[PDB]
Amino acid sequence: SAGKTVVIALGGNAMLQAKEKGDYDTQRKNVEIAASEIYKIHKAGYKVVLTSGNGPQVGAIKLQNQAAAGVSPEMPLHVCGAMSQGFIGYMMSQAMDNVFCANNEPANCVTCVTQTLVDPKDQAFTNPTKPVGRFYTEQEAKDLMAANPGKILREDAGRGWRVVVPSPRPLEIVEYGVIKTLIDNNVLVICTNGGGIPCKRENKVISGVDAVIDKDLATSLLAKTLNSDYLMILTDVLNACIRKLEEIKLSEILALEKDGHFAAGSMGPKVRAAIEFTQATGKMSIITSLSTAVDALNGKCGTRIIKD
Amino acid sequence: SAGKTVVIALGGNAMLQAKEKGDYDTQRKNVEIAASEIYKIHKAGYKVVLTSGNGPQVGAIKLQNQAAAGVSPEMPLHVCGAMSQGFIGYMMSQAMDNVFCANNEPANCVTCVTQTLVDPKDQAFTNPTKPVGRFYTEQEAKDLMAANPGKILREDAGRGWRVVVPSPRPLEIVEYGVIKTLIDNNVLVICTNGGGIPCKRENKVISGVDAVIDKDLATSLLAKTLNSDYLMILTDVLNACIRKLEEIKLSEILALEKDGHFAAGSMGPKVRAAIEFTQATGKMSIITSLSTAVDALNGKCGTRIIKD
Ligand SMILES: *SC(=S)N(CC)CC
Ligand SMILES: CCN(CC)C(=S)S
C-alpha cells in the first residue's frame, strides 16, 4: 500500500521449458515454479502487476480449432487469444493463491481478461512475424504450407519452423482503468496475458482483429500508463548480451540498439520495450531471468536500464 | 457509487438462441443484445455484477480437445472451463464496453477469471448430471458411448442427447474479495462464467477438479457472499410458472417447490437458487426474461421472490 509498483512480464519458460510438451500438468508445474519467484517480490513489499506471453498456448488453441472444424465451429485467432488468457490466467492465479496460502497470507489476486487496441492498418496484417504454437521440422513445415497456402511458417531461432501471425503495435490497454484501481487497492493483478486480445476501435466500437501482440511491447505500454516504478521482463537468460549489460544508461543502450547490436536473438523487442518505458517515465527497466528477479530489484544482477 | 447492487445471471439465450449453431458471430450478436438490456440497469444506476452459464461453450471446447487429441494435447474439463470463461468473458466485456461508449460513458468493466471450490466428495462426481455442448441423436450418442466407453450421454428437456459431467454444489468463490473490491469501486464486474472453474482445496493448495457447476447456485452464493441487494436470474422465459407467478412470498414459493411445481422442467435449480438467497439474506431474488430485466427491478413484472 506504500510499496512501489513493478510490472513483470513472464516469458515462455513460465510454462514451457526447452521443447517440453504443452500438456496441462507440465505447464502447471512450470507455473508453480514461477509463482514462487514472484511471491518473493510480493513479500519484499512491492505491488505486482503480472503479464506473460502467449506463443505456445494460443498456437495450440488455434491448432485445436483447425483440427476440429469438422466437428465444432472453428474460432478466430482473437477468440483463441481470449481462451489463452482464461487458461494462462487460470494457472497463474491458482499458483499465486497457493504460494500465498503456503505462507499463511490470504489469497488476494486476480486475472482480468484483457483487450488491447491496435491500428488495423498496421503493416503487420500483411506481414505475419510472430511465431506461435508447436515447432515443426524444416521439411515438416515445407509441406504443411504446400497443403494450406494460406499458412505462413518461418525458421525460429534455429529450433525449427513455426506458424506465424500478425503482430501489430499495441496502442491502448482497454482495461487500463480497472487495473489501476486493483493495484491502488493492493491486489496482485494478472493481466495482459499474451499481450491482450488484439482489437480495433472504429467509431466507438471495439472488435477483435486476428493477431498476437508482442507481450513485451504491450507490457511496456501498460507499465508506462500506470506510471509504474519498475518494468521487469523475465527471461531464461541471465543478462541481455550483445558482451553482457549490467547497470546501463538510456543513452548507451540506445546507441547499442540502433547499431543492430541486438538484431539477432529474441532480445530486440525486449530491449525496445525497456527503452520505451525508461524514456516515458524515467524509471528503471530490468531484463533478467525468472530465476534472478528479486536479485535484480535488489541491484545484485541483471540488465538494469536507467535514465541519463 | 450510491447504487444498490444487483447480481445478474445470464442464461443460454444470452449467447445461443434455439437451434443456432455456436460460431463466433452468432454468439457475439446474442451477447450484444443482452449487453443492451444490462446497460439499462447500469444507467438506472445499479451496481452490476454479471455472471452467466457455460454449457454450450465449455462443451464445445471439450469436444475440440477430444477431437484434436491426435494433434494437440487434450486439456482436462476444468482447464476447458477456464478457457470458456476467457471467451465468454471477453465477448461480454467487449459488448459492455461498446454499449457504454455508444452512450458516451467511458468504459468501466472487466471480466475476472473465477475459481469455485467444491466438495470433492459431492455425489455428483460418481453420478454425472449436467448436460453440455451440442444435441446428438439416440443414434449418434451410442456410437460415441462405445467408441468412447466412458463417455456419458443423456436426454435433456426432450430435444436430444448430450454429454454429461459432474455438477457439484459450490462452496466458495475464491476471487470473492477482489470482486467486492471491484463493485465497491463501481466497476461493472463480470465473473463466475458458467459457475467458475471447479476446484477443491486440501492442505491449503487449490487444484482443478473435472466438473461444471450450476451457474445459478454459484451466483446465488456469490450474491449471498457479496450481500447483494438483489439476485437476478435472467432467462428467455418471463416468469417462474407452474398459475402465473408475479410478486410472491418466500413462504409460498417454497411450498410450490415442495408440491413439486417446477421439478421436471428447467426451473428447479433457479428457484432453489433464489429461495436460498432471499432465505439467507431477506433480499429480493428476481426471475424474469432478459427482455424484462429493468421492468422487473422496476417492480412492474417478473417473478419477484420476497421474504415473509
Ligand atoms: S549473455 C550470454 S553470453 N549468454 C550465453 C552464455 C546468455 C545465454
Ligand atoms: C418470451 C419471448 N421473448 C419476447 C417475446 C423473449 S424470450 S425475448
Side-chain angles (χ1 to χ4, degrees):
Chain A
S1 195
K4 312 220 242 164
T5 296
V6 43
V7 181
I8 306 177
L10 300 174
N13 43 298
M15 300 159 287
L16 245 28
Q17 239 52 248
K19 222 135 318 160
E20 286 168 327
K21 251 94 165 194
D23 59 306
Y24 169 75
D25 260 65
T26 296
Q27 312 199 57
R28 165 180 60 81
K29 273 172 187 181
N30 270 318
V31 171
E32 296 175 3
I33 294 199
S36 54
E37 290 298 341
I38 307 297
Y39 184 72
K40 300 172 184 187
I41 300 172
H42 173 68
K43 173 151 162 203
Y46 295 88
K47 301 213 273 217
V48 184
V49 177
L50 246 195
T51 74
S52 57
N54 233 188
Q57 300 66 24
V58 73
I61 291 164
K62 179 42 154 191
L63 211 199
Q64 296 166 312
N65 265 257
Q66 280 147 213
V71 161
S72 210
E74 167 169 8
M75 299 292 178
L77 181 56
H78 68 94
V79 162
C80 288
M83 292 173 192
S84 69
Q85 285 180 6
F87 180 31
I88 299 153
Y90 164 57
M91 291 185 296
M92 236 96 128
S93 70
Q94 167 154 102
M96 216 72 45
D97 289 336
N98 287 335
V99 223
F100 269 58
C101 215
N103 292 263
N104 299 286
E105 174 166 11
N108 185 32
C109 154
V110 246
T111 302
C112 310
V113 169
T114 304
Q115 305 167 97
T116 291
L117 301 178
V118 304
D119 182 358
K121 295 177 71 75
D122 202 291
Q123 50 118 326
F125 292 109
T126 51
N127 177 44
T129 314
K130 158 96 190 145
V132 103
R134 245 197 69 180
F135 279 95
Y136 289 106
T137 289
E138 210 203 302
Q139 279 185 71
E140 246 168 52
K142 292 219 152 65
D143 298 305
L144 182 58
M145 273 188 278
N148 221 312
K151 284 203 163 189
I152 318 276
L153 279 84
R154 304 269 181 74
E155 205 279 56
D156 197 26
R159 297 174 278 164
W161 287 44
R162 217 115 83 87
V163 176
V164 152
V165 299
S167 198
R169 199 152 201 95
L171 304 188
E172 168 173 349
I173 313 288
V174 173
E175 283 84 15
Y176 160 77
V178 177
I179 304 178
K180 171 66 165 66
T181 289
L182 287 177
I183 50 197
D184 293 350
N185 288 270
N186 238 80
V187 183
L188 176 330
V189 185
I190 307 163
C191 70
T192 324
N193 294 292
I197 313 148
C199 305
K200 69 183 203 245
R201 194 206 268 129
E202 267 189 355
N203 188 81
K204 321 180 81 50
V205 22
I206 306 175
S207 61
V209 301
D210 289 313
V212 180
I213 283 134
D214 190 81
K215 139 257 183 183
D216 302 309
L217 288 173
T219 295
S220 193
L221 170 72
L222 175 64
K224 86 222 221 178
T225 311
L226 246 28
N227 195 50
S228 173
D229 288 308
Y230 298 79
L231 170 59
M232 285 218 333
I233 295 165
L234 296 187
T235 173
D236 49 26
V237 188
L238 193 33
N239 286 86
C241 264
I242 178 191
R243 173 182 63 111
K244 64 144 150 180
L245 285 1
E246 303 284 297
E247 208 149 281
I248 180 133
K249 269 169 186 174
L250 200 60
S251 285
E252 227 205 281
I253 192 71
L254 232 205
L256 295 188
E257 192 205 32
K258 41 194 169 193
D259 290 346
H261 290 148
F262 298 105
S266 72
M267 287 282 155
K270 298 188 186 325
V271 153
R272 186 83 222 122
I275 287 173
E276 285 189 334
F277 175 78
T278 298
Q279 293 207 0
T281 54
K283 323 227 214 342
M284 139 169 108
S285 28
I286 303 184
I287 311 177
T288 347
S289 83
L290 170 48
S291 259
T292 62
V294 270
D295 307 329
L297 273 183
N298 289 327
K300 301 189 179 316
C301 79
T303 307
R304 295 164 269 140
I305 303 190
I306 232 187
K307 62 176 204 95
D308 287 297
Chain B
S1 203
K4 317 241 203 61
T5 299
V6 61
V7 185
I8 310 179
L10 298 198
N13 98 99
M15 265 132 258
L16 296 49
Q17 253 58 266
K19 300 171 44 76
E20 281 177 318
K21 343 299 285 180
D23 59 311
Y24 183 56
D25 308 329
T26 296
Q27 281 183 90
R28 173 182 45 82
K29 303 277 191 179
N30 298 326
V31 168
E32 288 169 9
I33 288 169
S36 249
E37 295 313 311
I38 300 318
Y39 184 82
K40 284 145 181 164
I41 306 170
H42 171 78
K43 201 188 185 193
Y46 295 88
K47 265 156 40 158
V48 179
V49 177
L50 244 197
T51 78
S52 80
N54 203 20
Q57 296 72 12
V58 65
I61 291 166
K62 191 56 188 153
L63 218 204
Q64 266 155 344
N65 271 263
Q66 242 138 12
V71 172
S72 210
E74 146 155 29
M75 292 302 177
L77 188 58
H78 65 99
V79 173
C80 283
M83 292 178 177
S84 68
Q85 281 195 11
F87 167 52
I88 290 152
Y90 157 54
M91 267 191 303
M92 258 163 80
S93 57
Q94 188 175 98
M96 218 63 63
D97 298 321
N98 296 339
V99 208
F100 276 53
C101 195
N103 288 248
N104 251 258
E105 186 175 345
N108 201 34
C109 157
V110 269
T111 299
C112 295
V113 168
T114 304
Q115 310 168 81
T116 301
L117 298 187
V118 312
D119 197 336
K121 70 192 58 185
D122 196 279
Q123 44 69 26
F125 276 118
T126 55
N127 160 237
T129 15
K130 178 123 196 174
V132 135
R134 51 170 284 250
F135 294 78
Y136 286 99
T137 297
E138 276 226 31
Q139 284 147 333
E140 292 169 328
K142 276 64 157 193
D143 296 283
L144 259 58
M145 261 196 291
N148 270 142
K151 213 161 200 191
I152 311 291
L153 281 88
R154 308 280 181 78
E155 222 283 326
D156 170 27
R159 272 244 188 177
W161 293 62
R162 238 128 76 77
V163 166
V164 133
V165 294
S167 184
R169 161 170 254 80
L171 298 154
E172 172 172 359
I173 320 293
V174 181
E175 290 67 22
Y176 146 80
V178 165
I179 289 161
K180 144 126 169 41
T181 286
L182 286 173
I183 37 163
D184 281 5
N185 287 267
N186 277 86
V187 178
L188 148 9
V189 188
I190 300 160
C191 54
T192 317
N193 284 115
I197 300 138
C199 295
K200 86 210 167 215
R201 198 205 293 105
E202 54 203 7
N203 271 270
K204 306 147 73 174
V205 12
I206 301 167
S207 60
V209 313
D210 282 335
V212 172
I213 295 175
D214 178 270
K215 97 175 145 84
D216 297 321
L217 305 154
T219 305
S220 184
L221 158 75
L222 180 52
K224 179 191 315 167
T225 310
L226 246 10
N227 232 100
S228 182
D229 305 307
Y230 292 94
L231 174 57
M232 273 226 290
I233 302 146
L234 294 191
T235 184
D236 33 44
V237 246
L238 324 93
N239 285 76
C241 268
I242 304 168
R243 169 193 168 194
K244 182 141 101 74
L245 248 41
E246 337 276 26
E247 185 159 80
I248 193 187
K249 286 278 190 296
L250 190 53
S251 281
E252 199 177 355
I253 187 153
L254 245 185
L256 316 200
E257 167 152 87
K258 281 136 155 61
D259 289 88
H261 283 107
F262 318 101
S266 41
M267 230 62 171
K270 284 157 174 52
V271 177
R272 237 307 101 183
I275 282 176
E276 282 176 41
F277 169 86
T278 304
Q279 239 175 210
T281 73
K283 298 311 189 69
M284 178 165 109
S285 26
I286 292 171
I287 307 175
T288 29
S289 75
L290 171 74
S291 339
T292 73
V294 263
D295 288 348
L297 276 180
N298 274 337
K300 291 194 176 307
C301 57
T303 297
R304 282 164 285 135
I305 304 179
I306 240 85
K307 73 174 304 193
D308 309 293

PDB file of all heavy atoms in Angstrom, chain B residues 13 235-238 289 291, ligand 2:
ATOM      1  N   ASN B  13     -29.911 -18.157 -23.855  1.00  0.00           N
ATOM      2  CA  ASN B  13     -30.363 -17.171 -24.843  1.00  0.00           C
ATOM      3  C   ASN B  13     -29.502 -15.906 -24.836  1.00  0.00           C
ATOM      4  O   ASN B  13     -29.721 -14.973 -25.605  1.00  0.00           O
ATOM      5  CB  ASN B  13     -31.863 -16.852 -24.669  1.00  0.00           C
ATOM      6  CG  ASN B  13     -32.121 -15.570 -23.866  1.00  0.00           C
ATOM      7  OD1 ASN B  13     -32.370 -14.502 -24.439  1.00  0.00           O
ATOM      8  ND2 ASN B  13     -32.085 -15.680 -22.535  1.00  0.00           N
ATOM      9  N   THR B 235     -33.695 -15.361 -17.846  1.00  0.00           N
ATOM     10  CA  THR B 235     -33.867 -16.453 -18.794  1.00  0.00           C
ATOM     11  C   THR B 235     -34.509 -15.968 -20.102  1.00  0.00           C
ATOM     12  O   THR B 235     -34.546 -14.762 -20.359  1.00  0.00           O
ATOM     13  CB  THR B 235     -34.580 -17.649 -18.156  1.00  0.00           C
ATOM     14  OG1 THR B 235     -34.643 -18.744 -19.090  1.00  0.00           O
ATOM     15  CG2 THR B 235     -35.961 -17.268 -17.641  1.00  0.00           C
ATOM     16  N   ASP B 236     -34.926 -16.878 -20.967  1.00  0.00           N
ATOM     17  CA  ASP B 236     -35.678 -16.475 -22.143  1.00  0.00           C
ATOM     18  C   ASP B 236     -37.168 -16.516 -21.789  1.00  0.00           C
ATOM     19  O   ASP B 236     -38.009 -15.905 -22.470  1.00  0.00           O
ATOM     20  CB  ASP B 236     -35.351 -17.396 -23.316  1.00  0.00           C
ATOM     21  CG  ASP B 236     -35.056 -18.815 -22.871  1.00  0.00           C
ATOM     22  OD1 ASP B 236     -35.800 -19.328 -22.006  1.00  0.00           O
ATOM     23  OD2 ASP B 236     -34.075 -19.404 -23.384  1.00  0.00           O
ATOM     24  N   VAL B 237     -37.479 -17.230 -20.707  1.00  0.00           N
ATOM     25  CA  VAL B 237     -38.840 -17.304 -20.181  1.00  0.00           C
ATOM     26  C   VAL B 237     -39.104 -16.168 -19.186  1.00  0.00           C
ATOM     27  O   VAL B 237     -38.191 -15.716 -18.467  1.00  0.00           O
ATOM     28  CB  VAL B 237     -39.147 -18.691 -19.551  1.00  0.00           C
ATOM     29  CG1 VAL B 237     -40.217 -19.420 -20.369  1.00  0.00           C
ATOM     30  CG2 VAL B 237     -37.869 -19.540 -19.436  1.00  0.00           C
ATOM     31  N   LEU B 238     -40.358 -15.721 -19.146  1.00  0.00           N
ATOM     32  CA  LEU B 238     -40.716 -14.463 -18.484  1.00  0.00           C
ATOM     33  C   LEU B 238     -41.192 -14.552 -17.020  1.00  0.00           C
ATOM     34  O   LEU B 238     -41.170 -13.544 -16.304  1.00  0.00           O
ATOM     35  CB  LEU B 238     -41.744 -13.722 -19.335  1.00  0.00           C
ATOM     36  CG  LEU B 238     -41.507 -13.897 -20.834  1.00  0.00           C
ATOM     37  CD1 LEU B 238     -42.320 -15.083 -21.350  1.00  0.00           C
ATOM     38  CD2 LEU B 238     -41.853 -12.621 -21.595  1.00  0.00           C
ATOM     39  N   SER B 289     -37.317 -12.609 -17.780  1.00  0.00           N
ATOM     40  CA  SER B 289     -36.591 -12.825 -19.016  1.00  0.00           C
ATOM     41  C   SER B 289     -35.616 -11.681 -19.225  1.00  0.00           C
ATOM     42  O   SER B 289     -35.743 -10.621 -18.609  1.00  0.00           O
ATOM     43  CB  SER B 289     -37.534 -12.913 -20.214  1.00  0.00           C
ATOM     44  OG  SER B 289     -38.019 -11.634 -20.559  1.00  0.00           O
ATOM     45  N   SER B 291     -35.514  -9.823 -21.604  1.00  0.00           N
ATOM     46  CA  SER B 291     -36.248  -8.738 -22.240  1.00  0.00           C
ATOM     47  C   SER B 291     -36.920  -7.824 -21.228  1.00  0.00           C
ATOM     48  O   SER B 291     -37.342  -6.722 -21.572  1.00  0.00           O
ATOM     49  CB  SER B 291     -37.299  -9.318 -23.193  1.00  0.00           C
ATOM     50  OG  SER B 291     -36.965 -10.647 -23.554  1.00  0.00           O
TER      51      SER B 291
HETATM   52  C1  LIG C   2     -40.760 -14.603 -24.183  1.00  0.00           C
HETATM   53  C2  LIG C   2     -40.378 -14.315 -25.620  1.00  0.00           C
HETATM   54  N1  LIG C   2     -39.456 -13.188 -25.674  1.00  0.00           N
HETATM   55  C3  LIG C   2     -40.037 -11.928 -26.135  1.00  0.00           C
HETATM   56  C4  LIG C   2     -41.349 -12.170 -26.852  1.00  0.00           C
HETATM   57  C5  LIG C   2     -38.169 -13.296 -25.314  1.00  0.00           C
HETATM   58  S1  LIG C   2     -37.593 -14.702 -24.572  1.00  0.00           S
HETATM   59  S2  LIG C   2     -37.150 -12.133 -25.591  1.00  0.00           S
END
